[PDB]
Amino acid sequence: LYFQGVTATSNLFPEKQVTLKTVKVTYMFQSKDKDMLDFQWDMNYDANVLKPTANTTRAKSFEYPKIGSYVWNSLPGVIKANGNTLSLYDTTSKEIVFASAEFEVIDPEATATTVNLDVQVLRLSKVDPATDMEIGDEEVSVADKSIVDQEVFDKYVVANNTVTDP
């Protein structure tokens, strides 16, 4: 056997393995009927192997960084992000950038490492047209405590793709 390089994994997205200068990892999400109320993810990496590039920014981390209360913080070895708005993020009309980051291989001789997107919270809901505010009754958890609800997933999630470059 011969596979050595970056392993892109997640609790909510299928794993991808890429052989390597730079690697971009983008997790693409789409729901049916119910738009996104609240999300929290940590993209964990090895700070000794991979370093976030100049392209790893708040702006390029998520589809809707200016909408609702979006927190983005790049710390050593972890990119922490969470978003929320009672008006909801549009995850129904098209497939969105849920999480994205671009990493630089610090030492070209050291390629073998894991980038892992821990999706801690993903809640969907539907707005009352009269208010444009989410209906508390219609809230469903796709993910909570980093545990994906298979029944809710099968019902509401229509796209969950891991896209790498290369």
CATH 1.20.120 fits 6-165, yes or no: no
Q: What is the DSSP string of 92-108?
A: SSS-EEEEEEEEEESST
Provide the token pair at 27.
């997790």
What is the experimental method?
X-ray
User: Cβ(121)–Cβ(38) under 8 Å?
Assistant: yes
Cα distances from 110 to residues 9, 48, 117, in angstroms, run 19, 9, 21
Q: Which residues pair with 10 in a beta bridge?
A: 117
Residues near 6 by Cβ (< 8 Å), separated by ≥ 6? 17, 18, 20, 23, 25, 50, 103, 111, 113, 114, 115, 164
User: Cβ(124)–Cβ(86) under 8 Å?
Assistant: no
Domain boundaries of the chain, sorted by first residue: 6-165
Residues in the chain after which the chain is broken, C→N over 2.5 Å: 20
Cα distances from 42 to residues 49, 136, 154, in angstroms, run 18, 26, 23
36-62 burial code (b ≥16 CB/10 A, e <16): bbbbbbbbbbeeebbebbeebeeebbb
Resolution, expressed in angstroms to one decimal: 1.8
**106: alpha, beta or left, given left = phi > 0 and alpha = psi -120 to 50?**
alpha
